[PDB]
């Protein structure tokens, strides 16, 4: 690894600088280097890892959607043949996206998940595993698609099972997990009623636990509850 010679603490410091400079590819490369040092990640470090890759893959997904739409338009009746270029470039972006997802999944498998014994860390990583399989599923079309979808589902389900046993219903990781698993159900698994049920139950159980929270915890929990409500409004 190109980051093998840099100190762990220096990689974390540079990830924070990269975030400030909106250099998310660099940020992700630094955090990959930090993970590869082999030690567990603190809460702050887990956030840096997830922010970096979320932004990289988010940009790839946005680009893939633009290109996919152009390609779909080009394959409509009445469209003039433009050659292989749209497909080729969509495939290029797709392959780069798949590569980033595989990289993140590899970090989680070697060895972040297995070394995460506390519920908060294990749930965090299993959420990420569901998310990155979900991004693979968004572009998948081959013999493997059903298995990619099931890998996302299985990771999210294990995270849900641990979070319900070990975390309060207002915990932001538990809430964000449920938000994203609900989106999985709606957009990936073609289970809109499951998505709506999960978002509603999550919102209501968080509402009932807000009274236990400090003002600062309340802010984080209510922000995610508003995203649940936003999705419910979009879907109903």
């Amino acid at each position: 690894g190109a980051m093998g010679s840099m100190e762990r603490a220096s990689l974390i410091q540079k990830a924070k600088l990269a975030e400030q400079a909106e250099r998310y590819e660099d940020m992700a490369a630094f955090m990959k280097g930090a993970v590869e040092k082999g030690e567990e990640l603190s809460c702050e470090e887990r956030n840096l890892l997830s922010v970096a890759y979320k932004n990289v893959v988010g940009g790839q997904r946005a680009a893939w959607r633009v290109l996919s739409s152009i390609e779909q338009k080009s394959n409509e009746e009445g469209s003039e043949e433009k050659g292989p270029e749209v497909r080729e470039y969509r495939e290029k972006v797709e392959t780069e996206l798949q590569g980033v997802c595989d990289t993140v999944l590899g970090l989680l498998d070697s060895h972040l998940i297995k070394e995460a014994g506390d519920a908060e860390s294990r749930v965090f990583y299993l959420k990420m595993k569901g998310d990155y399989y979900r991004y693979l599923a968004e572009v998948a079309t081959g013999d493997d698609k059903k298995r990619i979808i099931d890998s996302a589902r299985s990771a999210y389900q294990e995270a849900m099972d641990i979070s319900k046993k070990e975390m309060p219903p207002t915990n932001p990781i538990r809430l964000g997990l449920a938000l994203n698993f609900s989106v999985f159900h709606y957009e990936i698994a073609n289970s809109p009623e499951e998505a709506i049920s999960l978002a509603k139950t999550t919102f209501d159980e968080a509402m009932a636990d807000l009274h236990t929270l400090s003002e600062d915890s309340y802010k984080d929990s209510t922000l995610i509850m508003q995203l649940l409500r936003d999705n419910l409004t979009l879907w109903t």
Partner: peptide
């Protein structure tokens, strides 16, 4: 697109 975090 729906919200995720």
């Amino acid at each position: 697109f729906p919200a995720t975090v």
